[PDB]
Amino acid sequence: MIHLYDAKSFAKLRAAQYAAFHTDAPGSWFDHTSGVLESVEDGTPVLAIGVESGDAIVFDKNAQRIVAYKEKSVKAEDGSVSVVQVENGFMKQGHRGWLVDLTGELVGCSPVVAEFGGHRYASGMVIVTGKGNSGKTPLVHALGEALGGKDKYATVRFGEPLSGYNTDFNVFVDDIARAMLQHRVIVIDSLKNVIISRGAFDLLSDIGAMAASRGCVVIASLNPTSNDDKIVELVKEASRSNSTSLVISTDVDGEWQVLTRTGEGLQRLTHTLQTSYGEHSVLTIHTS
Amino acid sequence: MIHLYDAKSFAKLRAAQYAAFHTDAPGSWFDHTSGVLESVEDGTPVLAIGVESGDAIVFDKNAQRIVAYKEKSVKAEDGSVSVVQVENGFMKQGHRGWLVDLTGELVGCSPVVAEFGGHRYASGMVIVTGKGNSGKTPLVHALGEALGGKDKYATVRFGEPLSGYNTDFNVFVDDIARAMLQHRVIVIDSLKNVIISRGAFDLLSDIGAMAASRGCVVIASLNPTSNDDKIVELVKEASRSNSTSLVISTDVDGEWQVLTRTGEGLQRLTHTLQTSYGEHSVLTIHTS
Amino acid sequence: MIHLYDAKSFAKLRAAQYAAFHTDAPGSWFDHTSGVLESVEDGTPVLAIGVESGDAIVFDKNAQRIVAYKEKSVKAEDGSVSVVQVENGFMKQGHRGWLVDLTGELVGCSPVVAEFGGHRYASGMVIVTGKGNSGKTPLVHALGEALGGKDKYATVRFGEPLSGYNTDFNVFVDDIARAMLQHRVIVIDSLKNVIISRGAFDLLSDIGAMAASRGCVVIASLNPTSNDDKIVELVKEASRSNSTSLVISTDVDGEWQVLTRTGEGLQRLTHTLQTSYGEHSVLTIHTS
Amino acid sequence: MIHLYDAKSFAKLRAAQYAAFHTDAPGSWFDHTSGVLESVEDGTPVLAIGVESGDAIVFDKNAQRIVAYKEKSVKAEDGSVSVVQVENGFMKQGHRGWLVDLTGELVGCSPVVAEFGGHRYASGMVIVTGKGNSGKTPLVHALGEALGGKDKYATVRFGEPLSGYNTDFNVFVDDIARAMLQHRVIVIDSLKNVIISRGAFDLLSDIGAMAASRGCVVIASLNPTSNDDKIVELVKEASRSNSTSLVISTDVDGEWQVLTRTGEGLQRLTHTLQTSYGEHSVLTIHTS
Amino acid sequence: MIHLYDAKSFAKLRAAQYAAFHTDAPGSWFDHTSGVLESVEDGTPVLAIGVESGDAIVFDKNAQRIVAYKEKSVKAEDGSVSVVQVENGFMKQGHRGWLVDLTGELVGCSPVVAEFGGHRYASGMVIVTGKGNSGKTPLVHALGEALGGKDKYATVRFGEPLSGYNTDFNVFVDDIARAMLQHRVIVIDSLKNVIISRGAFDLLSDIGAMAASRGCVVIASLNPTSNDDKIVELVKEASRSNSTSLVISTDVDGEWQVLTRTGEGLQRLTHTLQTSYGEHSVLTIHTS
Amino acid sequence: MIHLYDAKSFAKLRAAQYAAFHTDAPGSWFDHTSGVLESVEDGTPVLAIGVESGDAIVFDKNAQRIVAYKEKSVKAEDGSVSVVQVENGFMKQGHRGWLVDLTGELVGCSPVVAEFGGHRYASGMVIVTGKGNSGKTPLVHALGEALGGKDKYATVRFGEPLSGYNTDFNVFVDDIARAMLQHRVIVIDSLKNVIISRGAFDLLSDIGAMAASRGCVVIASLNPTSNDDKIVELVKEASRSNSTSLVISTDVDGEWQVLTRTGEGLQRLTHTLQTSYGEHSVLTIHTS
Ligand SMILES: Nc1ncnc2c1ncn2[C@@H]1O[C@H](COP(=O)(O)OP(=O)(O)O)[C@@H](O)[C@H]1O
Ligand SMILES: Nc1ncnc2c1ncn2[C@@H]1O[C@H](COP(=O)(O)OP(=O)(O)O)[C@@H](O)[C@H]1O
Ligand SMILES: Nc1ncnc2c1ncn2[C@@H]1O[C@H](COP(=O)(O)OP(=O)(O)O)[C@@H](O)[C@H]1O
Ligand SMILES: Nc1ncnc2c1ncn2[C@@H]1O[C@H](COP(=O)(O)OP(=O)(O)O)[C@@H](O)[C@H]1O
Ligand SMILES: Nc1ncnc2c1ncn2[C@@H]1O[C@H](COP(=O)(O)OP(=O)(O)O)[C@@H](O)[C@H]1O
Ligand SMILES: Nc1ncnc2c1ncn2[C@@H]1O[C@H](COP(=O)(O)OP(=O)(O)O)[C@@H](O)[C@H]1O
Ligand SMILES: [Mg+2]
Ligand SMILES: [Mg+2]
Ligand SMILES: [Mg+2]
Ligand SMILES: [Mg+2]
Ligand SMILES: [Mg+2]
Ligand SMILES: [Mg+2]
Alpha helices in F167-250 (DSSP H): 169-182, 198-214, 231-242
Distance, CA of A218 to chain centre:
4
User: Chains E, F: CB contacts under 8 A, how many?
Assistant: 147
D152 is in an annotated binding site: no
Beta carbons of C50 and C173 less than 8 angstroms apart = yes
Tell me the domains of chain B and their CATH numbers.
1-41+104-288 (3.40.50.300), 42-103 (2.30.270.20)
**Quick one: which atom of ligand 1 is closest to the CA of A133?**
22
Using CA atoms, how far residue C243 sits from A217, C121, C128, D92, in Å, is 58, 13, 10, 39
Q: How many residues does chain D have?
A: 288
E135 CB within 6 A, ligand 5? yes
User: For C169, which DSSP code?
Assistant: H
Beta strands (DSSP E) in C95-139 are 97-98, 112-116, 119-122, 124-129
Alpha helices in C167-250 (DSSP H): 169-182, 198-214, 231-242
Q: State whether D160 and C215 contact (CB < 8 Å).
A: no
Beta carbons of D48 and D174 less than 8 angstroms apart = no
Whose Cα sits closest to atom 15 in ligand 3? B265
D217 alpha carbon to ligand 10 midpoint, in Å? 18
Beta carbons of D180 and D65 less than 8 angstroms apart = no
Residue F198 burial class via C-beta count within 10 angstroms: exposed 0-12, middle 13-18, buried 19 and up: middle
What residues contact residue D79 under an 8 Å CB cut-off, 6+ apart?
A: E62, E63, E178
Triad D79, D82, D88: Cα angle to 5°? 165
Amino acid at A170: N
* Minimum-distance CB partner of A163 among F1, F212, F265: F212
What SS3 string covers chain D? CCEEECHHHHHHHHHHHHHHHHCCCCCHHHHHHHHHHHCCCCCCCCEEEECCCCCEEEECCCCCEECCEEEEEEECCCCCEEEEEEECCEEEECCCEECCCCCCCCCCECCEEEEECCEEEECEEEEEECCCCCCHHHHHHHHHHHHHCCCCEEEEEECCCCCCCECCHHHHHHHHHHHHHHCCEEEEECCCCCCCCHHHHHHHHHHHHHHHHHCCEEEEEECCCCCCCCHHHHHHHHHHHHCCEEEEECCCCCEEEEEEECECCCCEEEEEEEEEECHHHCEEECCC
B185-189 and B153-157: which strand pairing? parallel
Q: Which of A127, A136, A255 to mutate to test the pocket of ligand 1 (most atoms within 8 A of CB)?
A: A136
Q: How many residues does chain C have?
A: 288
F138 CB within 6 A, ligand 6? yes
Which of these, A254, A215, A271, lies nearest to A28 by C-alpha position?
A: A215
Which of these, B189, B266, B182, lies nearest to B220 by C-alpha position?
A: B189
H or E element in which residue F124 lies: strand F124-129
Nearest CA in chain F to E75: F64
C92 is in an annotated binding site: no
CA distance F284 to F278: 7
Residue F43, Cβ neighbours under 10 Å: how many?
11
Q: How many residues does chain B have?
A: 288
Q: Looking at beta carbons, which residues of chain B come within 8 Å of C64? A: 81
**Quick one: which atom of ligand 3 is closest to the CA of B265?**
15
Using CA atoms, how far residue B227 sits from A196, B158, B231, D46, in Å, is 20, 21, 6, 58
Alpha helices in C23-115 (DSSP H): 28-38
Beta carbons of A68 and A84 less than 8 angstroms apart = no
CA distance C86 to C55: 11
CA distance C121 to C144: 12
Q: What angle, rounded to 10 degrees, do the helices at C7-22 and D136-148 form?
A: 150
B235-242 long-range contacts (CB < 8 A, ≥24 apart) are: B235/B129, B235/B195, B236/B129, B236/B130, B237/C225, B237/C226, B237/C227, B237/C228, B238/B195, B238/C225, B239/B127, B239/B129, B240/C133, B241/C192, B241/C225, B242/B125, B242/B127, B242/B204, B242/B205, B242/B207, B242/B208, B242/C161
Q: What are the φ/ψ torsions at residue E130 (nearest 5 degrees)?
A: 135, -170
C104 is in an annotated binding site: no
CA distance C282 to C140: 11
Beta carbons of D70 and D85 less than 8 angstroms apart = yes
DSSP assignment of chain B: --EEE-HHHHHHHHHHHHHHHHTSPTTHHHHHHHHHHHHSPTT---EEEE-TTS-EEEE-TTS-EE--EEEEEEE-TTS-EEEEEEETTEEEES-SEESS-SSTT--SB--EEEEETTEEEESEEEEEE-SSSSSHHHHHHHHHHHHHTTS-EEEEEBS-SSTT-B--HHHHHHHHHHHHHH-SEEEEE--TTT---HHHHHHHHHHHHHHHHHT-EEEEEE---S-SSTHHHHHHHHHHHH-SEEEEE-SSTTEEEEEEE-BTT-PEEEEEEEEEE-GGG-EEE---
**Quick one: which atom of ligand 3 is closest to the CA of C139?**
21
Helix (H, G, I), strand (E, B) or coil at C146: helix
List A72's β-bridge partners, or say none: A84
Binding residues of F: 133-137, 160, 189, 192, 223, 261, 268, 277, 281
List C246's β-bridge partners, or say none: C127, C259
User: For C55, which DSSP code?
Assistant: -
Q: Which of A53, A57, A162, A231 is best to mutate for the F interface (most F CBs within 10 A)?
A: A162
Distance from CA of A103 to the nearest CA of F (A): 27
Q: Which of E127, E131, E134, E162 to mutate to test the pocket of ligand 5 (most atoms within 8 A of CB)?
A: E134
Helix (H, G, I), strand (E, B) or coil at F233: helix
Distance, CA of F232 to chain centre:
22
Distance, CA of A202 to chain centre:
13
H or E element in which residue E239 lies: helix E231-242
Binding residues of B: 133-137, 160, 189, 192, 223, 261, 268, 277, 281
Beta carbons of E169 and E202 less than 8 angstroms apart = no
Q: How many residues does chain F have?
A: 288
Q: State whether B165 and A266 contact (CB < 8 Å).
A: no
C119-122 and C112-116: which strand pairing? antiparallel
Q: How many residues does chain E have?
A: 288
Beta carbons of B244 and B252 less than 8 angstroms apart = no
CA distance C159 to B254: 33
Which of these, F85, F264, F49, F269, lies nearest to F169 by C-alpha position?
A: F49
CA distance D5 to F153: 47
Beta carbons of D198 and D50 less than 8 angstroms apart = yes
DSSP assignment of E100-146: S-SSTT--SB--EEEEETTEEEESEEEEEE-SSSSSHHHHHHHHHHH
Helix (H, G, I), strand (E, B) or coil at F238: helix
Helix (H, G, I), strand (E, B) or coil at A162: coil
The torsion defined by the Cα of C260, C261, C266 and C267, in degrees rounded to 10, comes to 30
Which of these, A45, A42, A89, lies nearest to A67 by C-alpha position?
A: A89
Binding residues of E: 133-137, 160, 189, 192, 223, 261, 268, 277, 281
Q: State whether E148 and D212 contact (CB < 8 Å).
A: no
User: For F281, which DSSP code?
Assistant: G
Q: Looking at beta carbons, which residues of chain B come within 8 Å of A12? A: none
CA distance D170 to E55: 27
CA distance E282 to E277: 6
Distance from CA of A168 to the nearest CA of F (A): 6
Using CA atoms, how far residue B104 sits from B108, D235, E99, F83, in Å, is 11, 50, 72, 60
B137 CB within 6 A, ligand 2? yes
User: Which residues lie near ion ligand 7 (Cβ < 5 Å)?
Assistant: A 136-137, 221, 223
* Minimum-distance CB partner of A213 among B148, B163, B175: B163
CA distance F242 to F212: 12
What SS3 string covers D43-87? CCCCEEEECCCCCEEEECCCCCEECCEEEEEEECCCCCEEEEEEE
Helix (H, G, I), strand (E, B) or coil at F285: strand
Q: State whether C80 and D174 contact (CB < 8 Å).
A: yes
Q: Which of B134, B165, B275 to mutate to test the pocket of ligand 2 (most atoms within 8 A of CB)?
A: B134
Q: Do chains C and E touch (3 or more CB pairs under 8 A)?
A: no
Distance from CA of F67 to the nearest CA of E (A): 13
Q: Looking at beta carbons, which residues of chain F come within 8 Å of A174? A: 80
Return the residues preceding each gap in chain C, C–N over 2.5 A, or none.
Answer: 195
